[PDB]
Design a protein around this ligand. Structure first.
Ligand code: NAI
Ligand code: SHR
Length: 367
């Protein structure tokens, strides 16, 4: 049989779960044994998992679980966990693109003889991702960006966009954003132009979807992707946009989309940068204008400019947790076919590809 163990998330404010109660109920009917840690931050009630058939165990009991259990979780391990990782782990580890500290992430697996099957690199035969939160991120990102832009029209510069909390549904999020937005227009603010780079992807789509729902007109949205950026940055259309939303998948080293020089300019219209891609700790980050990773409880950081109006960056790295329950159901449904193959993970290509990718990255690590 396969035994799975759903780890309680420890990333602050992370409310999503990698397996939902439905997903657990379906896996049990397929013969899996499933443990679920009682999580204080999860949007799901522990009783939904009880009724699904999960064995309920305490938060962080994965650490002492039998070595045959596959530990599944969404987000990073705490930096302060330094002991060897001995299980097979399914999670997002963000350590295959030379993010700051990537060697330390992998070294725990190397010392424990564990295996990382990274959620981002689970792909079908045709090179496409099997499960992805991108749409919910571009959506949530675009919502906070429009909210920030609107705030800057109706509030003192002294003030920053206040803490956000997760929403019970998209309708309620769109209602908040639409209020702030109409309120700013009512006072004479010009309808914003929004520049989206990576517009054709998952998060680009979610961001266009939000902008439509809130009532920004198609003409006001510049939808850029690889065509439009082949000339290479930095670009002039960024400082002249009202809102810039970065939705690229950064894979190759590229010329930065803008810089401090271009932004220090009295005639800059740009008020809000939504860095959805959020390759903040990447050495090739094509948005080197900030260094802070913002969080729901403090969602914007000031980009200190020497000319032009107050500009802020949003760089929350788990935007989909603004809408935790449906984001989780969406992702787990799309993940399920792969998880059903875990009994055969030694031969199933989706799993094997991911194991071989892990071994090649571990080979790059200094010993
Ligand atoms: N902040 C958060 O909570 C989240 C962040 N993300 C991040 O978003 C990034 C993209 O995710 P997805 O939308 O699923 O990827 P995706 O692969 O669906 O779309 C990426 C788009 O960027 C375009 N692109 C790539 N390089 C470009 C360039 N140099 N110039 C212009 N366009 C370029 C591609 O053609 C593609 O259409 C990921 O790296 C992911 O880590 C995703 C989910 C949540
Ligand atoms: N682009 C960065 C990471 C951005 C943060 C991603 N967090 C997302 C991932 C979801 C997905 O890709 O499906 C999240 O939803 O927690 C990197 O490559 O290191």
């Amino acid at each position: 049989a396969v035994t799975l163990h759903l780890r309680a998330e420890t990333k602050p404010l992370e409310a999503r779960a990698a397996l939902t109660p439905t997903t657990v109920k379906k896996l049990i009917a397929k013969g899996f044994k499933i443990y679920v840690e009682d999580s204080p931050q999860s949007t799901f009630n522990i009783n939904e998992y009880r009724q699904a058939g999960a064995i309920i165990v305490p938060a962080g009991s994965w650490k002492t679980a039998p070595r045959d259990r596959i530990i599944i979780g969404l987000k990073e391990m705490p930096e302060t966990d330094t002991f060897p990782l001995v299980h097979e782990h399914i999670q997002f580890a963000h350590c295959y693109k030379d993010q700051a500290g990537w060697q330390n992430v992998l070294m725990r697996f190397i010392k424990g003889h564990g295996t990382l099957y990274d959620l981002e690199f689970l792909e079908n035969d045709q090179g496409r991702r099997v499960a992805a939160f991108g749409f919910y991120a571009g959506f949530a990102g675009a919502a906070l960006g429009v909210r920030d832009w609107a705030f800057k029209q109706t509030h003192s510069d002294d003030e920053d966009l206040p803490a956000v909390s997760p929403y019970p549904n998209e309708k309620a999020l769109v209602k908040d954003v639409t209020k702030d937005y109409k309120e700013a227009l009512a006072t004479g603010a010009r309808k914003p132009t929004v520049l989206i780079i990576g517009a054709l992807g998952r998060s680009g789509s979610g961001a266009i979807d939000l902008l439509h729902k809130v009532g920004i007109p198609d003409a006001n949205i510049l939808k850029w992707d690889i065509k439009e950026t082949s000339r290479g940055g930095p670009f002039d259309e960024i400082p002249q946009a009202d809102i810039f939303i970065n939705c690229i998948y950064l894979s190759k080293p590229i010329a930065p989309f803008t810089n401090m020089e271009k932004l220090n300019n009295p005639n800059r219209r740009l008020r809000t940068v939504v860095d959805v891609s959020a390759d903040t700790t990447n050495p090739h980050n094509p948005i080197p204008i900030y260094t802070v990773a913002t969080v729901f409880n403090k969602p914007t950081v000031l980009v200190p400019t020497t000319a032009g109006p107050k500009l802020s960056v949003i760089s929350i790295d788990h935007l989909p947790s603004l809408l935790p329950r449906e984001a989780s159901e969406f992702f787990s449904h799309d993940l399920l076919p792969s998880l059903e193959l875990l009994p055969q993970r030694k031969t199933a290509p989706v799993w094997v590809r991911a194991k071989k990718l892990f071994d090649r990255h571990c080979a790059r690590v200094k010993r």
